[PDB]
Amino acid sequence: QIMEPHDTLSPAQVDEYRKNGFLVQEHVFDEEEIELLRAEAAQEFASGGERVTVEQNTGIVRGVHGCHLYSEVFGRLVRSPRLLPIARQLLRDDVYVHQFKINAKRAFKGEVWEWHQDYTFWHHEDGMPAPRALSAAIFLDEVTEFNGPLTFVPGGHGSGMIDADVKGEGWANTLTASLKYSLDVETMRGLIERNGMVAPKGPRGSVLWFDANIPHSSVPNISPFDRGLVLITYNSVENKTDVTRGTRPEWLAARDFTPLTALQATSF
Amino acid sequence: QIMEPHDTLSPAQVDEYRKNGFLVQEHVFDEEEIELLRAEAAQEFASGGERVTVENTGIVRGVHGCHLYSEVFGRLVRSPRLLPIARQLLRDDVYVHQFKINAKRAFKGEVWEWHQDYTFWHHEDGMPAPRALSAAIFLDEVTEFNGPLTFVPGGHGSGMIDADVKGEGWANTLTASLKYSLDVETMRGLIERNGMVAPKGPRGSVLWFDANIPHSSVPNISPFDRGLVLITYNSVENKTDVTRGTRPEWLAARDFTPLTALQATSF
Numbered sequence: 295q296i297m298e299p300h301d302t303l304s305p306a307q308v309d310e311y312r313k314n315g316f317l318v319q320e321h322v323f324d325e326e327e328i329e330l331l332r333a334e335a336a337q338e339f340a341s342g343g344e345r346v347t348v349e350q351n352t353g354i355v356r357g358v359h360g361c362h363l364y365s366e367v368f369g370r371l372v373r374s375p376r377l378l379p380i381a382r383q384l385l386r387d388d389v390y391v392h393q394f395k396i397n398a399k400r401a402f403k404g405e406v407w408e409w410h411q412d413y414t415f416w417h418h419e420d421g422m423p424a425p426r427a428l429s430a431a432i433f434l435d436e437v438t439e440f441n442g443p444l445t446f447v448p449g450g451h452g453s454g455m456i457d458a459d460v461k462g463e464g465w466a467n468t469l470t471a472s473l474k475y476s477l478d479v480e481t482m483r484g485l486i487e488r489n490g491m492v493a494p495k496g497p498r499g500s501v502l503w504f505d506a507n508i509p510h511s512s513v514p515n516i517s518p519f520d521r522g523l524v525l526i527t528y529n530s531v532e533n534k535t536d537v538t539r540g541t542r543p544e545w546l547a548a549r550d551f552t553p554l555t556a557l558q559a560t561s562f
Numbered sequence: 563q564i565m566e567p568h569d570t571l572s573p574a575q576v577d578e579y580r581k582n583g584f585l586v587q588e589h590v591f592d593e594e595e596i597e598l599l600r601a602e603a604a605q606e607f608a609s610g611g612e613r614v615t616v617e618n619t620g621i622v623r624g625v626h627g628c629h630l631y632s633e634v635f636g637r638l639v640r641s642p643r644l645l646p647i648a649r650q651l652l653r654d655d656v657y658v659h660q661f662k663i664n665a666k667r668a669f670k671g672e673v674w675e676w677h678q679d680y681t682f683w684h685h686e687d688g689m690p691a692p693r694a695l696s697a698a699i700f701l702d703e704v705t706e707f708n709g710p711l712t713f714v715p716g717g718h719g720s721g722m723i724d725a726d727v728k729g730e731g732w733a734n735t736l737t738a739s740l741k742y743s744l745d746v747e748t749m750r751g752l753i754e755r756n757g758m759v760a761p762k763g764p765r766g767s768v769l770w771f772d773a774n775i776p777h778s779s780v781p782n783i784s785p786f787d788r789g790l791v792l793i794t795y796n797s798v799e800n801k802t803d804v805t806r807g808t809r810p811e812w813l814a815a816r817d818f819t820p821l822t823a824l825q826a827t828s829f
């Protein structure tokens with residue numbers, strides 16, 4: 295009977311997150327915790343059925359989606375006192391999970407993620423009315439320069455949504471190497487020319503926080519080292535999506551907007 | 563379909579609260595909001611029955627647990643002007659341990675003896691630690707002369723202090739003459755070290771104060787009322803040991819469900 299008092303971000307941390315559109319906290323989770331998250335990720339890849347995506351070239355696991363609805367471990371993770379208080383502080387509201395994914399980015403054969411803003415998809419596919427949302431990516435493996443790290447244009451969220459060409463009809467291609475919305479090179483080259491690019495690194499158990507509208511990308515992982523990320527997308531409850539205008543299953547775009555509460559210490 | 567984003571306290575404000583044991587935010591609620599709360603309060607005094615306390619004169623002095631009976635007060639404790647700060651200060655999800663409205667009528671009012679709230683919540687209710695706080699909403703301007711709450715700044719920083727226990731039961735936990743009151747010598751000591759302060763402010767302000775800060779107040783000699791809505795928030799982790807509890811739910815809550823903030827609806 296005692297969890298550690300909720301920790302929130304410093305005012306400088308908050309500033310950095312607002313100016314850059316991302317922020318890394320190192321070693322939020324320890325090794326044993328990361329090993330539990332890894333074992334549960336594996337179970338979900340094995341048993342997720344239609345919720346699992348596979349790589350085009352190899353048929354190797356690319357993603358598993360909506361796990362917090364199906365796994366007791368992931369349903370508790372999203373309420374962790376290491377995460378929830380910060381989601382609530384950054385979004386200045388009570389929050390809920392809009393989306394939960396584990397992106398495997400396997401060694402050697404892990405494929406690209408093209409440049410995009412997340413809000414673009416959540417707005418047009420799910421009816422998210424404003425970009426008042428964020429993601430927390432938990433590193434199940436050390437992130438280096440060589441294993442296809444998640445990459446951002448810092449400050450690139452200052453513009454809001456950005457002209458992306460749509461491509462195709464339903465939603466299967468929202469999770470693929472070739473993405474339904476994506477930035478056109480010209481659009482990108484200029485962002486990059488103006489703002490640069492940054493790929494934050496960190497050890498296992500770090501959490502990378504980022505804005506719903508920051509442009510980001512990742513190159514193929516041809517290295518020998520996996521780069522497993524657990525991505526939790528937190529949305530402001532006031533900003534709940536309009537389910538009238540929603541097109542995807544629950545396991546991609548949540549419908550239950552109950553405010554999350556933090557996990558308390560129990561004897562089990 | 564918009565509430566104002568949750569506001570929290572600055573690092574300065576938070577530091578000021580921890581060192582002094584209290585903090586005023588001026589003008590949280592407007593005159594119109596305050597009036598709706600004043601009218602609901604009057605309803606509660608009128609219909610509260612056994613939950614209502616009276617002063618010499620039988621003038622209603624207090625009513626308790628209104629958040630459980632009034633929809634307005636049930637909503638107020640979830641307000642985005644209140645709940646986010648209670649969570650920030652207690653560093654937890656929170657729930658309401660106690661809710662009370664204390665009237666201190668113009669030319670009327672009694673002397674509340676020096677006391678620490680946590681002394682009652684620990685011994686009567688089973689609150690295991692002082693990880694709790696109270697938010698006092700000013701229904702009227704609080705001045706020098708209408709019996710303001712008065713504190714010893716930093717007085718919370720030692721423990722719960724040893725106190726005279728008079729009476730058995732809980733009737734005298736709500737009375738001018740309190741069940742646990744602070745010894746004369748012990749207070750003198752505290753006051754000679756720390757001094758005394760009565761925070762002031764306009765109507766609609768909120769006075770946050772620690773569960774263990776010593777406080778007192780005197781009768782009101784102004785021709786103006788001093789209504790306080792006092793909401794006591796407790797950390798969920800700090801929930802009270804219900805097996806050691808002695809008082810009803812309208813004084814000491816037993817439903818520990820984390821509060822969630824109030825959202826915009828069309829009604």
Ligand SMILES: O=C(O)CCC(=O)C(=O)O
Nearest residue numbers: 397407412444511512523
């Ligand atoms: O795993 C990655 O590098 C990118 C994932 C991402 O941005 C997403 O799935 O939206």
Ligand SMILES: O=C(O)CCC(=O)C(=O)O
Nearest residue numbers: 664674679711777779790
């Ligand atoms: O309203 C007052 O002046 C006294 C409040 C108080 O300290 C209490 O009811 O515990």
Ligand code: PRO
Nearest residue numbers: 393412415416468469
């Ligand atoms: O479709 C989605 O919502 C996620 C986020 C952008 C790419 N895949």
Ligand code: PRO
Nearest residue numbers: 678679682683735736
């Ligand atoms: O009994 C109670 O809980 C309140 C707090 C101290 C005075 N009366």
Ligand SMILES: [Fe+3]
Nearest residue numbers: 410411412510
């Ligand atoms: Fe993305």
Ligand SMILES: [Fe+3]
Nearest residue numbers: 677678679777
């Ligand atoms: Fe008191």
